[PDB]
């Protein structure tokens, strides 16, 4: 008698994000809480580094730190893979290649724990330059709008995504982060495998002036598009 799929997303849903990271041997954890509203495609989240100082720039973790909160227009609802997997959820895996620098590999479980949508991530960063833009903390505390191109992966009963994130560098240069993404449902329940489309993803980062801990406040608007 449980709610599944779209019915889990009719209103505002609480979100928990938990990440463990190891980048060039630097261990860290992140905890985020807030809420998602798939009716307007809006996310509001506050993140803290629970292990002290974050050894990489916050912007490099944004894509890793819940695409089930994307607004799918009424005419695109049958192409929403992300909600179709809920509540059992999906595994989201990425390779993120920073141009002229190291690579993040991520594995996340996105699923309901009671009434909360939880994103549980393990992140391994390898082959970073200790004096590069990432471990050297030379990325601006800001974020650009990006389109995430989604395609069905019928062999894996899931989806793939490819996109390049543009991180503004303090000297005015750009640090590219090439993303390779695959999502696989948890369990044997069938999912909706979409026609090619994209998620228009708009991100605003801010700081709480009263917060002493290493932290990131995030707002996102995400809208699916590209199907008629
Ligand atoms: Ca700048
Ligand atoms: Cu049920
Ligand atoms: Cu180091």
Residue numbers in the entry: 0 to 64, 66 to 228
Article excerpt on this structure:
Here, the high-affinity copper(II)-binding tripeptide GHK was fused to the N-terminus of a GFP variant and an MBP-FG peptide fusion. The GHK tag promoted crystallization, with various residues (His, Asp, His/Pro) from symmetry molecules completing the copper(II) square-pyramidal coordination sphere. Rapid structure determination by copper SAD phasing could be achieved, even at a very low Bijvoet ratio or after significant radiation damage. We further show that an N-terminally fused GHK peptide can be utilized in standard crystallographic methods to enhance the crystallization of proteins and to provide reliable phasing sites for structure solution with minimal effort.
GFP proteins have commonly been crystallized in MPD with Ca2+ ions, and a second crystal form of GHK-GFP could be grown at pH 5.5 under these conditions. High-resolution data (1 × 360°) were collected at a wavelength of 1.34 Å from thin plate-like crystals to 1.3 Å resolution. The GHK tag in crystal form II shows completion of the coordination of copper(II) ions in the equatorial plane by the side chain of Asp76 from a symmetry-related molecule, since at this pH the other histidine side chains will be protonated. In this crystal form, two additional copper sites were identified, one in each molecule in the asymmetic unit. The first is a weakly ordered site with an occupancy of 0.29 coordinated by chain A residues His25 and Glu132. The second was a highly ordered site occupancy of 1.0 coordinated by chain C residues His25 and Glu132 but with additional coordination by His77 from a symmetry-related molecule. Calcium ions were also present in the crystallization conditions and we modelled an octahedral calcium site in each molecule in the asymmetic unit, with occupancies of 0.56 and 0.48, that are coordinated by Glu142 and water molecules. The sites were verified using the CheckMyMetal (CMM) server.
